[PDB]
Amino acid sequence: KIEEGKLVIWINGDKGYNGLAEVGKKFEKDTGIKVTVEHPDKLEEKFPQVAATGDGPDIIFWAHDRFGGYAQSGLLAEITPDKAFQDKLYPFTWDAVRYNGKLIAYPIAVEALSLIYNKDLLPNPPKTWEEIPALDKELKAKGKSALMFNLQEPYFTWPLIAADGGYAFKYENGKYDIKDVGVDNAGAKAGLTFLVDLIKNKHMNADTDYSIAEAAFNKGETAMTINGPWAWSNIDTSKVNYGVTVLPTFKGQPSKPFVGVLSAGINAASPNKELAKEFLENYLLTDEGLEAVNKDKPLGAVALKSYEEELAKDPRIAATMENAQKGEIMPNIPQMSAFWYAVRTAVINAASGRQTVDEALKDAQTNAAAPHRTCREALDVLAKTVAFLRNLPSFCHLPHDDQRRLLECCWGPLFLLGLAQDAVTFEVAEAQPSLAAVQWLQRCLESFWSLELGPKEYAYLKGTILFNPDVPGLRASCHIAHLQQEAHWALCEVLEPWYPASQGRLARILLMASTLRNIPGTLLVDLFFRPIMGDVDITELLEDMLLLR
Amino acid sequence: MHRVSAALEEANKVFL
Ligand SMILES: OC[C@H]1O[C@H](O[C@H]2[C@H](O)[C@@H](O)[C@@H](O)O[C@@H]2CO)[C@H](O)[C@@H](O)[C@@H]1O
Numbered sequence A: 001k002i003e004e005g006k007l008v009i010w011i012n013g014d015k016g017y018n019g020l021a022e023v024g025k026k027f028e029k030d031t032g033i034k035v036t037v038e039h040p041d042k043l044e045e046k047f048p049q050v051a052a053t054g055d056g057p058d059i060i061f062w063a064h065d066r067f068g069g070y071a072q073s074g075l076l077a078e079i080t081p082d083k084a085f086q087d088k089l090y091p092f093t094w095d096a097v098r099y100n101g102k103l104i105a106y107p108i109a110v111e112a113l114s115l116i117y118n119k120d121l122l123p124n125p126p127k128t129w130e131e132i133p134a135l136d137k138e139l140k141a142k143g144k145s146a147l148m149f150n151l152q153e154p155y156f157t158w159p160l161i162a163a164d165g166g167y168a169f170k171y172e173n174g175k176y177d178i179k180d181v182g183v184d185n186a187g188a189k190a191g192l193t194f195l196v197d198l199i200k201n202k203h204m205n206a207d208t209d210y211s212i213a214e215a216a217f218n219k220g221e222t223a224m225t226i227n228g229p230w231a232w233s234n235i236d237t238s239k240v241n242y243g244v245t246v247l248p249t250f251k252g253q254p255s256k257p258f259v260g261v262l263s264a265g266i267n268a269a270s271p272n273k274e275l276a277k278e279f280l281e282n283y284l285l286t287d288e289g290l291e292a293v294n295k296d297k298p299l300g301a302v303a304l305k306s307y308e309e310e311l312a313k314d315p316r317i318a319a320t321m322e323n324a325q326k327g328e329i330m331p332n333i334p335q336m337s338a339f340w341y342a343v344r345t346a347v348i349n350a351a352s353g354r355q356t357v358d359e360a361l362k363d364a365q366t367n368a369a370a371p372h373r374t375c376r377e378a379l380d381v382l383a384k385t386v387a388f389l390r391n392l393p394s395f396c397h398l399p400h401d402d403q404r405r406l407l408e409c410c411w412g413p414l415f416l417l418g419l420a421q422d423a424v425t426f427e428v429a430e431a432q433p434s435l436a437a438v439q440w441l442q443r444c445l446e447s448f449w450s451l452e453l454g455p456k457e458y459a460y461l462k463g464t465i466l467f468n469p470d471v472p473g474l475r476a477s478c479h480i481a482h483l484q485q486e487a488h489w490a491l492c493e494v495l496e497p498w499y500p501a502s503q504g505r506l507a508r509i510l511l512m513a514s515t516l517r518n519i520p521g522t523l524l525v526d527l528f529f530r531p532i533m534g535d536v537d538i539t540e541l542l543e544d545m546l547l548l549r
Numbered sequence B: 001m002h003r004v005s006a007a008l009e010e011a012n013k014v015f016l
Helices: A017-031 A043-053 A064-072 A091-096 A129-140 A154-164 A186-200 A210-218 A229-236 A273-284 A287-296 A305-311 A315-326 A336-352 A357-368 A373-390 A400-408 A411-421 A435-451 A455-466 A477-493 A502-517 A521-528 A538-545 B004-015
Strands: A007-010 A035-038 A059-063 A106-111 A114-118 A145-147 A167-171 A176-182 A222-227 A242-245 A258-266
Touching: A007 A017, A007 A273, A017 A035, A017 A273, A017 A287, A043 A059, A043 A064, A059 A064, A059 A273, A064 A258, A064 A336, A091 A106, A091 A258, A106 A229, A106 A273, A106 A315, A114 A229, A114 A315, A129 A145, A129 A186, A154 A186, A154 A222, A154 A258, A154 A336, A167 A336, A186 A336, A186 A357, A210 A222, A210 A229, A229 A242, A229 A315, A242 A315, A258 A273, A273 A287, A287 A305, A336 A357, A336 A435, A373 A411, A373 A521, A373 A538, A373 B004, A400 A538, A411 A435, A411 A455, A411 A502, A411 A521, A411 A538, A411 B004, A435 A502, A435 A521, A455 A477, A455 A502, A455 B004, A477 A502, A477 B004, A521 A538
Parallel strands: A007 A035, A007 A059, A145 A222
Antiparallel strands: A059 A258, A106 A258, A114 A222, A114 A242, A167 A176
């Protein structure tokens, strides 16, 4: 349960975990305390998962922007660095780790996204984004690209989005306005609109991720790329003469990259708080310490004044700083999680074409500024759905095995059809279901709200969905089939007064109902119930309300 | 086994 006498450390996979491991070996040889450095995936969300239960690592490394939330949740311990030690680090990096007036982590280094270009290919990197498309046009003539960076993380595309006017939370009087979100204003829209047009014009792929971008650049397939200090290490070992410089300017204005401060926090549930402090203060946060780490993968501008002055001569670090000035420090408030997820969803939906720029930034702006009013409405619909089945003798008189069987694969469509008729727009704020699925869910749902069905149509349709003869191992299969046919005949008579239009309505409603049946029951739980009642077994819960279990 | 229509309309009233 977080073992005593040992020290487990978690750090992102793109950092110099090997260099850190070495500092751990030196630490282990001196104190006799084992130190294991792990780098799990989705660490950003995996830490809080276990941290709450009481387990997890003793020390956690990540940008300050997340620590604020972990603090509120009570997953971190307030560090106790004596005055003397504080003076060794820049007072500028101490604010990044200060939440509600308490230091919640040790500052390690300041990182900022910069433009990395291949000198041999581009002796002169572009000054503006606008001039990139044309630059890609000819580079292609030689089987090469112009720009290639990760599009799966809004962190990389933010500089462009905020360039014109986009921003997370308005800042005034040393305070953040959790209600003022600028992710769907004129500025943000233009920026993301440019990014999309780059994909549409085949100047960039939508599925491009971190790995793809890195490989493509280190192999000389792309002329430029956007990354942080940690990425300079792998480029060196590759035959590429790169150069780190200021990011392109969009619409005359500079790109404002979010500045982050790599920080180390101590788990509030660890019995090695002292062993931790000792390690982060007398080993890692030292000239030799940060050098070992930096040696593996660059840390940018280290918080340790002494070691910072040595690397200050590095032209690459200077570029990172130039870019950092143009940008702004990341907020560390609890809502930052909701923000990032909302933005991540918008950028990916727009790049993949599942949504338009306006549609994407529309939902993000609403989700970024998060009520579980959605879930509470799903619960009402579910209960409603139970009352609907308790009535309707046709279903109550069916064999119990059939009742449980029809329920096992119909509660989904039945429930969704309930949300529709109950007129409840949803705000999926999941601060892991696939975006494609979620997007498909709402499209179908909005399809019902625009078709404007009546009370009869809904009722007869529900019958068509409930009594499904195709359900494997069904006893009263023939009778159920006769029941579905009746509902289908009724659904038609309610649409019979026609001359022209009602004809395309039956096919429309029908196909729409079919898309409902193709929605993962698992997805429904994670989107409407889990967030309010933890893990849940709908089939089980429903058989209880209907006394079938 | 018939007139399931009238039944459905009545049973789904809870959603009005
Ligand atoms: O993409 C959203 C993500 O951005 C930041 O994460 C960065 C991290 O700070 C960098 O040091 C490096 O690891 O790349 C990450 C993005 O891939 C935020 O710190 C993070 O909370 C946010 O979700």
